[PDB]
């Protein structure tokens, strides 16, 4: 996260880190046994790390649980990033409390201008790289679909939205992929792609979670 702030320990209790011997993506806990992340984050050997703040120090609220199932949307296109969503089933249920908690799925899509919270352990620099120890946060608005399309001609599908800034300096970046965009207490977005990070006129692009609620519920029910 570029241009953001230190969240504070366990203030984003649905935020998870996906770990394969290193942090490589974020995700969002949606019930005690399931996480939502980006399809582009798929790999074998995922360990889900819940209750993290400092991802480099064991502090006491961590739960480390192996993925049992990692389910990429059947229509994910890796060239366009359409349908950039994956469901991860945990091998055992997480213990839910104030510091490890699920986030609600949307009952409707969010409107342009709605302020959202974007979080992750990604890069905090727009030029070069620096990776934080602790979780970072950014408040960012949903942009109009026309502004999104003007920014990214020919590239924005009905399953994507833009959030953030056009003036530069505030965005999700390397290591934030798969993580949450939460608006009014609902998971509306997944960190998906952009042209660089925090560049002028190039806002972040996010998977539009409200389109997938029925798919998520059916997938969980059947697995």
């Amino acid at each position: 996260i570029v241009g953001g702030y230190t969240c504070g320990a366990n203030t984003v209790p649905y935020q998870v880190s996906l770990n394969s011997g290193y942090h490589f993506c974020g995700g969002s806990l949606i019930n005690s046994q399931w996480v939502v992340s980006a399809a582009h984050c798929y790999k074998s050997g995922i360990q889900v790390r819940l209750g993290e703040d400092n991802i480099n120090v064991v502090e006491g609220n961590e739960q480390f649980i192996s993925a049992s199932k990692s389910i990429v949307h059947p229509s994910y296109n890796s060239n366009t990033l359409n349908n950039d969503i994956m469901l991860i089933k945990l091998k055992s249920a997480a213990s839910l409390n104030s510091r490890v908690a699920s986030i609600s799925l949307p009952t409707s899509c969010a409107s342009a201008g709605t302020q959202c919270l974007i979080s992750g352990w990604g890069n905090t620099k727009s030029s070069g790289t620096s990776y934080p120890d602790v979780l970072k946060c950014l408040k960012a608005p949903i942009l109009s679909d026309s502004s999104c399309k003007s920014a990214y001609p020919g590239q924005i599908t009905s399953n994507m939205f833009c959030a953030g800034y056009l003036e530069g300096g505030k965005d999700s970046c390397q290591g934030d992929s798969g993580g949450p965009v939460v608006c009014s207490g609902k998971l509306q977005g997944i960190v998906s792609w952009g042209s660089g990070c925090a560049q002028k006129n190039k806002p972040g692009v996010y998977t539009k979670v409200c389109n997938y609620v029925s798919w998520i519920k059916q997938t969980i029910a059947s697995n």
């Binding site: 490589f24 980006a38 582009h40 890796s78 390397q174 290591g175 992929s177 798969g178 792609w193 042209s195």
Partner: peptide, 12 residues
């Protein structure tokens, strides 16, 4: 470039 914020990035 057009890239994902994964480690490593996926760019296009």
């Amino acid at each position: 470039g057009r890239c994902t914020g994964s480690i490593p990035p996926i760019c296009f």
